[PDB]
């Protein structure tokens, strides 16, 4: 059991694409005859590659300004049951 550290050049990956970086690295190295198990522990993105992406549409700081909620954690609720209720009954439970 050993950890292997592998370096990849920046130029081979597409700009602003998670699909490519996932297809290239974790494509078909898994399912190899020479090794019984494989697990990816961590990944490092350089600054130059991060700048291509949009990122989150708003983020933490902008969200709180839009909602006007400061100081505390936000409280949520999931409606039960998962499957069964009517559209009118669903809205009453929400209210």
């Amino acid at each position: 059991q050993f950890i292997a550290y592998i370096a990849y050049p920046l130029d081979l990956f597409e700009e602003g694409s998670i699909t490519n970086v996932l297809t290239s690295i974790v494509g078909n190295v898994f399912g190899f005859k020479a090794l019984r198990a494989l697990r990816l522990e961590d990944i490092r993105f350089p600054v130059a590659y991060i700048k291509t992406f949009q990122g989150p549409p708003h983020g933490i700081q902008v969200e709180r300004d839009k909602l006007n909620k400061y100081g505390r954690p936000l409280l949520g609720c999931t409606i039960k049951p998962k499957l069964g209720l009517s559209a009118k009954n669903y809205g009453r439970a929400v209210y």
């Binding site: 909620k69 400061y70 100081g71």
Partner: protein, 108 residues
Amino acid sequence: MQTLPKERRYETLSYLPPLTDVQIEKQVQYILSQGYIPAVEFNEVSEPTELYWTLWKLPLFGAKTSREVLAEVQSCRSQYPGHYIRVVGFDNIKQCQILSFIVHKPSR
């Protein structure tokens, strides 16, 4: 079984019982200990739609004691007895508000 009464609420720390003057002093002490800048804001009407309240004087950039903030809260209270009054705390690094709570409601 009991039914919940209809009541109008005012963001953070509005479900707790109305704050004592010592309780206000302890909350302001937190803002100063952390390093944030305390400020007093006032408005005529409390609505969810509006997100700007009129700023009372300037943010208190130089504040050594929590008593100095309380004296500014009392000044705005005596000037406007029929306005909503809240205490805010600004952070400079993160560039976001860290605390906001209502100290005064329009008297009758």
